[PDB]
Write a protein that binds this ligand. Structure first.
Ligand SMILES: NC(=O)[C@]1(c2ccc(F)cc2)CCCNC1
Ligand SMILES: [Zn+2]
Ligand SMILES: [Zn+2]
Ligand SMILES: [Zn+2]
Ligand SMILES: [Zn+2]
Lengths: 69, 69
């Protein structure tokens, strides 16, 4: 039905929100500290000296184990 | 259709996986450091001395800003 299409779009958007904002390919699993923005995979987070959301300096990267993983 | 019901179930399960494992009411937004388990809301994470998943000592809690928030 049309509701099947609506639900498919909601699921796609929720799944896309869990993917890295830089490479768009791998799941988010890393936090920039101390700002707390958790928007990258471990490979993109390792290559950024500044947070891509707020531009704060990245002091270090914390790996996150999320139940959605 | 039956496909609409299957998609509704997938959406519901993904949304439930984003909720605090202790209170089941608030969104997960806190990480236990250094282990990295990100399973609680700020209130529930505040008084735990050890991780409820792996038993590692919690040295501090890092707030996380997730795109799914
Ligand atoms: N000890 C902690 O877990 C907090 C904290 C963490 C790191 C830090 F540099 C200062 C304070 C304190 C307040 C609430 N939870 C966060
Ligand atoms: Zn990436
Ligand atoms: Zn940031
Ligand atoms: Zn809670
Ligand atoms: Zn843990």
């Amino acid at each position: 039905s049309q509701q099947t299409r609506v639900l498919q779009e909601k699921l796609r958007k929720l799944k896309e929100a869990m993917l890295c904002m830089v490479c768009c390919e791998e799941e988010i699993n890393s936090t920039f500290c101390p700002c707390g923005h958790t928007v990258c995979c471990e490979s993109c987070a390792a290559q950024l000296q500044s947070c891509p959301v707020c531009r704060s300096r990245v002091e270090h990267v914390q790996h996150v184990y999320l139940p959605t993983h």
